[model samples]
Target: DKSYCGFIAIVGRPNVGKSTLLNKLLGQKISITSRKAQTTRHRIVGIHTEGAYQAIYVDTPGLHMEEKRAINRLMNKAASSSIGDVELVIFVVEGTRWTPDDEMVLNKLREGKAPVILAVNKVDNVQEKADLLPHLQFLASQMNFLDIVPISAETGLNVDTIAAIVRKHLPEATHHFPEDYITDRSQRFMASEIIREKLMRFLGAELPYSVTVEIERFVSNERGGYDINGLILVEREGQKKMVIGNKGAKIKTIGIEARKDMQEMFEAPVHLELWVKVKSGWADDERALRSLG
Candidate 1:
């Protein structure tokens, strides 16, 4: 049997579970997951190696209809950029209903060169699989897709089916990554993402789209642990105070939660030190974004 290797990009609108889907497919957290919309700011790549195939999955930021700023422009570019280069494009949609925004995404998929697969996520909440027929019919009317997969990232429902479908599209080739490899992102990048994930969970909607976490110092200890020092950059002093909270309670909570997740992710104890700083309009500055990277 010949091996197969290919790239698959997962693109969708905000809160559609693109990150969660990728994480579930890989059976590990390559990209951070959060309840907040726009939690994903960059394209995270997860590599899956099976017996005879290597699948590189790209998780992109959610596409919004009303994007005008530079950040939104970058996000749109990030989402659309994955279209032509991959073997397949997985267009994820909310399971509950088909919105006008979904139609827009379908149009985008129709224009893309790659084969499209409709992944209707969050279906675990529905009582019956038959309940999604209407939504599926509506999508089919928009464009012809290679497959329609209904899944729940949280519950791992039908996730294997989606993976199997995607793997079938890949061409037979040698494995692109080693068997032990999972993701392309660095530990520092994962650490920052972990911190951002915690902030998004705790701050909810109050967390701005511009906020970025940067790890300034990471010291490995002989006790099979590490101490991390980082800063959370916000757009205003008010936001900083909110992140820090009265008497530093909020920041402490954020650190505790983030540290726990970090330890699990790194498989070692982590001593995290987080500081909140004000960097007004940091998102508008390309240098700031590059620095965060």
Candidate 2:
């Protein structure tokens, strides 16, 4: 009769370390992160089980009010859908940086009835502890947050405190996931995300949101190995050039980087064959979003 479970949507504007906080909470890297802004492309649903209490954390795409593209609107949709139904919302923001976009996130949270707990992330990098007093005071004047906890997601400082708060707010229900379960996503799905993450990290500035990765083929091969074929999609011929690099160098680099990740992520050895495909205007095509990643 002691089991408890609940949903907490971690939300914020782009590049605010929302994914980083989710990973810190789960003690694993289920969500992907990069310095670039927007389009995580999907929801990162992970379960953090602490004894009799389980908190299913969903890291939504950062809510940005700027872009008018199909992909950007899609990102906002993926983000807004997570907030309205959660038992709690962990509204994370940077320690030193505050923008009008942060204000826009507050407007979005206004649509949801869930009680929000303000998580001031990246506190380890703050040079002056006393400076946050005024910053926090300004934020407190805007909304009635359930509680506020300053934390450093990368350094694991005060992450447990937020976890305890999340658990305390859960409904008295049985654990939703099995004890050993960490995430609902499969390895194949994670493979695509891993490749896309490396792509975002390497070519974030030049890489358009039109870029995406799809696992075209994957199977086990002899000699204790795997046969993995991945298709890299771009919006135009020039993007193919951008992805392939000079003399097939960029694609080769991505292949090497992606293969290395796959090898480390999988128990079996990896054989990767990566190909580039052009989709022309798929980013503008609303129907193509479901299979974009």
Candidate 3:
């Protein structure tokens, strides 16, 4: 039974750089990255094929005790659902300090059936390498993880070791995806997610939690380009105005920044059109959250 294939779920509190780690592992920006907490609202799958193994990495939303809204429940469900079915679980935590939320997540991991790996991320910022020892000890006291690796996802420090570690736990099976493929998301989903990522960076705290982008249309041009149309759904009028900016200057900046990345992603020029609209309490609406997929 040497043919390896399995699933690995990356789970942790919000803003712990889970998306960043996934993008780094896959060597591409498939998952959307943002400074805001809970930026990933759904379970994104990043596939890795090497030698005779196929590892499907599931990037789940930040685990939180959010029992209020339907969308929040959905996000929590997405995180919890990844725990039992995976061959391996990666518990990502900030290198600085373990909060109470981290403790709760650790307790959940203790109850899970899969083998967990503690990934103490953000070690690149520490002035001394030994500073991570205490955090490692704290995590070890919390649960019996298979391994604890201190690495920096941003600086590519020790990231190469992560794939090898994950592959060790995969069961022997045939490759689930081709070697060239890296993600399960379609181009349309990636385009919309990229647009949302730009909004998250530019809009900041004002609308990050209340905004979601949907790709309405995508048209290929005869001049080696593309025309993309998207709707930026907001929870209020003020948020919409903020996204549109004064005299449309802010939206222009967002479009400029997003188009540059889109050009690189699509390998051609991109003409992206972003329009802002108001959708009250869309976050709590099941239909709105489902529509985001």
Candidate 4:
């Protein structure tokens, strides 16, 4: 009778530290993040459970105005629609910096009925403490936020406070997920996302955007380890060659890095195999996008 559970949407413009905050709050890395913008192209959910309280945090893709491609439009729609159904929302933004994209996110939140808490992230990057006052004031004027707090996601600053604030807003309902469950996604999905995260970190600026990872096989092997075969899809043969690099160096490095992360995440040994192939305009194709999902 005392259980509490609810959905909290974490939304913002690209590179606003939404994924970092989500990972910080959960004390786990269910969502992927990178220095590159739009590193989170999918809507991911990280679950946090404390005694009788449980919060399902929806880590959405950063809302952007660039809908030139079908994939971009799909990402934008996923981010925008998440807020409308959530019980509470965490509107994260970079400290002391505001852009048209931030304004666009604010406008979209204004259209939704959920209560929003303004989380001003990356405060550690702000040199002048006095500069935040006016910026916070300006953000307050944009809409009626339930609360505004400055935080540093990278350093775990004020992350617990954000969780505490969200805990108070949780609805009086039974916990939707089991206590040990950290996310709603399956291990197969996590493997693909982990590979994609490495792709985003290792590949050139525009290359990761045109690439996607698919786990063709994930199985428990006889050696008490996992056997995972991953296929890296790119838009062109040249991009495939770029992913492979000279003498197969790049893909080898990426696979090693990805395998290390998987071992840690899965808490077991991981034998990973990677291959690169050309999908030819997959990102711009809605059918391919749905199949990728």
Candidate 5:
């Protein structure tokens, strides 16, 4: 059979279910997710392959109006880039709710070189079916969408149609990845992301922003288990104390949760060692930001 290839960007403002849709599209958890805005700080890639066509979806950092920090500007630049470069763009938005950030992202999509397919995400939360038509209609009046598909990425509804629509745009080419391959990220990268996701979930509003995880080392031991060393970076000593918790309870919980997810990814036993260090101002440091990815 002849091969076909294309890249589809999943773009939207933060926390609009772009990563959730990516997970559903790949039928696996390649990108880490949480309810927090800016949960995804980098561009994550997941690939889907059928008989003759392959579609690569890039889950970009959510674009927003906030440009307070250096990282915020970096993420905005990263997310908007895929808008103009990819073969097709999957513009995702929440159902019946619109934010200024969505308007900010819409402005970027309008400048893209590719056709845009809109996904009205979170339809499962639409209590009244009649409540949806007007909101969807309002969105339709905004731009010339190639196709508007209502989907519940959380509930796995109408997500397959996203691929079916995108595949028709793919051009004939040799597939780049193997049949069983799904993502471009490594196990070590995903391991750190899982740890970060747990920290995001377990911390309060202000703390998650000041935290970052680095996988210092990952190796196999004689007992057929993986030995992993992770460093947790904080901006201050007080933040370190909070991350460590009273007698190390919070960090322990984060490790336990992350190890569970890691074992599932590695399909083997895992030994995770977590340590917290103060980094002063790594977020503003462009070298540190590039090194993280």
Candidate 6:
């Protein structure tokens, strides 16, 4: 069979289920996701292959107009930078909801060189099916989309159609990655992401953006298990106290949850340790973000 491969980007504003759609597309979790905005800070590549067709999906951080901090600016840069460069773009948006941020993404796509496939996600939450027709039409009129697919990334609705559409557009070329490979990110990066995901879930409302996880140590031990150490960095002492909680209960819960997810990812016994520290202005420091990555 002839090989076909191309880079496809998943772009949207924050909390619009881009990463969720990516996970569903790949049938695995390479990107960390949460209900909070800016949960994904990095540009992660999730590769999907079927027969001789390979679609390399770039799961980017949500592009937003809120460039209030250096980190937000960096995220916006990461999110929008993929637009014109890829072979195809999967522009994802929440169902029945339109915001300036979404428009901002559309505006960026308007300047892109690649064809756009609009994936209107979260239709499962739409109570009235008739409400969708006009919204889809509105999206249709907004841009010359290759296709407008209403998908529920949570329920696996029309997601396969997204894949099928992607496959049809894939340029005929050799696969960019090994057939068995699923993502471009290293296991270490995913380890930090898993820990950060737990932190995001546990501290949903408080300090979501300020906290970052660093895997200080990751090694294979002789007991046929993994030894992992994660360092949780916050901007303030108060944030540290919040992460630790009463008698370190919150941190413990985060560690336990992260360890479980890590075990599933590594498929080995995981001996995990977590530590929380204050790193005053890391988020606003470009050097810090660069070094963290």
> Candidate 1 vs candidate 6: which has greater TM-score?
6
Where does candidate 5 stray beyond 4 Å?
29-44, 60-85, 180-293
TM-score of 1: 0.54
Error of 2 at 75 (Å): 23
lDDT of 4 by residue, 1-293 (tens): 59888778898888888867876787633234333232333344567898888887765423223321322243344523322236788999998889999888888787877888999998999989999898889889988989999999877788899989888988888765568652324688788788977887777564633345677778998888999888776656677777888898989999999999999999999999887766644344544544551
**Predicted candidate 2 versus true structure: per-residue lDDT over 1-293, tens digit per residue:** 58888767888887777866776776632233333233333343567887888776765423223322222243344523322236888999999678999988887776777888899998988989889999999888879999989998766789899888888888888765567552334566667776877777667568864455677777888788888877777657777877888788888888899889989988779988877777544333445643554
TM-score of 5: 0.55
Q: State every prediction's TM-score relative to the real structure.
A: 0.54, 0.55, 0.54, 0.56, 0.55, 0.55
- C-alpha RMSD of each candidate structure in angstroms: 13.9, 14.0, 13.7, 13.8, 14.0, 13.6
Model 6: how large is the Cα RMSD against the reference? 13.6
lDDT of 1 by residue, 1-293 (tens): 67888768788776788877776787632233333232334343567777887786765323233321222343344523322236788999877676777666666676767888888888877767787778678777777888888888766788898888888978766654568652325677678787877887888766654465678777789998998887787656687878888898889999999999999999998988876666543344544654562
TM-score of 6: 0.55
Cα shift from native, residue 274, model 1 (Å): 12
Better of 2 and 3 by lDDT: 2
Q: Order of all candidates by lDDT, from best down to worst?
A: 4, 6, 5, 2, 1, 3
Candidate 6 per-residue C-alpha lDDT over 33-93 given as tens digits, one digit per residue, 9 for 90 to 100: 3322323343434678878987767654232233213222433445233222267889999
lDDT of candidate model 2 versus the reference: 0.71
Going through the candidates in the order shown, the clash numbers are 2, 0, 2, 0, 0, 0
Superposed by TM-score, candidate 3 places the C-alpha of residue 30 at a distance from the truth, in angstroms, of 8.9
Please report, in order, the local distance difference test score of every candidate based on alpha carbons: 0.70, 0.71, 0.69, 0.73, 0.71, 0.73
Worst 10 residues of 2 by lDDT: 63-72
Superposed model 6: Cα runs more than 4 Å off: 29-42, 59-85, 182-293
Name the candidate, 1 or 2, with the larger lDDT value.
2
* Residue 133, candidate 2: alpha-carbon lDDT: 93
Badly placed stretches (over 4 Å) of model 2 are: 29-44, 60-84, 182-269, 272-293
| lDDT of the structure predicted as candidate 3 | 0.69
